[PDB]
Structures are given as structure tokens and as C-alpha cells.
Amino acid sequence: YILQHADALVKRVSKLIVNEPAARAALRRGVGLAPEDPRMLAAHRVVAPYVPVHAVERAFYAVAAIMAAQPRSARDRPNLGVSLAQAVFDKGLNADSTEQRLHLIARQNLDGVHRHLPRLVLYLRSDQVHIDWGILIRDLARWGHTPRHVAREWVQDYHRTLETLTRQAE
């Protein structure tokens, strides 16, 4: 389900971004802010119609905006943990430090994920790390019902894929 509308947002947006400068600037001004906040209303005009509990809508708005606030250097089924571990092993980011940030997000609430998440994801996309935004969207949607479950999946995926990537370098 949800993933279907999420894919519509990823093509649309990702397609409405690199192909638009005014819309890109109008949606990026609302990263890490509630959909209720006036400052992001300029964004509804692009994303509001696909919002399929309330947590969701917050999810779609979030990702959409954060996905849109990347530098151009980053512009142009795995989870986020596997993307982080592969980014550590490949791009050589700090491992132990991205480690504590993962352990801090895995405890947050629906409102905390969207305020702790932007630094790691936007910085992760910095230095061109691949990130499947659709899975991330459905994940942010999964905080409304199973926060701890999604958190556990993110962390587990990270360590398991880090271990397998280290062992396959035998």
C-alpha cells in the first residue's frame, strides 16, 4: 500500500525538483518542521494531494522536503541501515560516530525522528550515498504504529550489512 503513493512522490518530486527551481526552493524551506506550521504551506501545492495515522502525512511532507533540500552534487530492496553501513565501508565515513547517531534515532518518537533524521540523511546524501527514499518514507510512516519495530530493522540492517560487507572482503 503506502509504498505505492510513496513511489508517486519519489518520481514526481525527484522529477519536479531537478526540473524546477522555484518549487525546489519552496519545498526545501520546510525540512524538520510540522506540516501544521505555516512556513511549509508553500509545499502543500506540490505534495499535499498524495497524503494517503496522522503520523503519515508528517512522514511524506518530511522526506519530500528533506529529499529536496540536498545539494545538486547529490542529485543524479535496501533500507537506510544498509545504506549507512555501505556508506561507511565504501565512502569511509566515521563508523563509531555514525554509530551513536543511529543509536539515538532508534529511540526517538514520531516527532523526534523528523528532527534528528535530517542531519544524518542530508549529510549522508552528501558525498553521493545511495538512499532509497520510498523505503525511508514508508519507514517514517511506520513510526505511527510500530516505532520500535522500524528502529530495530534500521539498526539490524546496518550492523548485519556492515558485518557481511566486512566478511565478504576476505
Binding site: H103, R107, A151, R152, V155, Q156, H159, R160, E163, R167
Partner: protein, 110 residues
């Protein structure tokens, strides 16, 4: 001699990785808490491990194992990993314990 050799290299890989899963589980729970997992771990493990062995002796096909190959085939790796995840599943929850539990699960990969 070859049939017995398969049986030995089997019982060997089998208990060897099984006890390695014991140390794994035990240590894991301690370093986490800085253990209840070992008892249930072994229960499902051996209970799941006897039929896989008996399939190896009769040279029947067992998933993760290749029929009629002298090497062990690391079938018991997949059994122990399935048992380990069946026991430690709900406690790989908080990020710390998840870190220890998986970093000690990696050892069963061989």
C-alpha cells in the same frame, strides 16, 4: 570410509558451531547488559538440528547443503543462525543490545 567420513565431518561441524553459538549467545547477553538466551537457544537448536543431520547421513537434500559432497556444506550454520534469530529477535530492539547481538551473530557465519 567415505560415508563415515561424511558423518564425522558432520557431527563435527554440528556440535562445534553449536557450542560456538553458545558462547556467542552467552557473551552477547552479558556485553549487552554489560543468560536466558542460551537455554532456549539450545532447545530450538538441537531440536531443529537432529533432522538436518539425519538428512545429511542419508544423503538426502537439505537446504544450505549440497548432496554427495565431502565437505560439511555449512548447513548447520543456517540452522544455528535461524535458531539464534528465533531466540534473540525481540531483544535486538534497543539499538545497543542490537549492536552487541548482531556483532556476535556475525561469528556464526563461518
Amino acid at each position: 570410509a567415505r560415508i563415515v567420513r561424511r558423518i564425522t565431518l558432520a557431527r563435527k561441524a554440528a556440535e562445534a558451531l553449536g557450542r560456538r553459538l553458545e558462547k556467542a549467545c552467552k557473551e552477547a547477553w552479558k556485553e549487552s547488559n554489560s543468560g536466558p538466551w542460551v537455554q532456549h537457544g539450545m532447545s530450538r537448536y538441537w531440536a531443529k538440528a537432529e533432522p538436518v543431520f539425519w538428512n545429511i547421513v542419508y544423503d538426502r537434500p537439505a537446504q544450505g547443503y549440497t548432496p554427495g559432497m565431502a565437505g560439511p556444506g555449512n548447513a548447520f550454520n543456517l540452522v544455528a543462525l535461524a535458531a539464534y534469530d528465533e531466540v534473540t529477535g525481540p531483544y535486538c530492539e534497543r539499538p545497543r543490545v542490537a549492536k552487541v547481538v548482531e556483532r556476535h551473530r556475525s561469528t556464526l557465519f563461518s
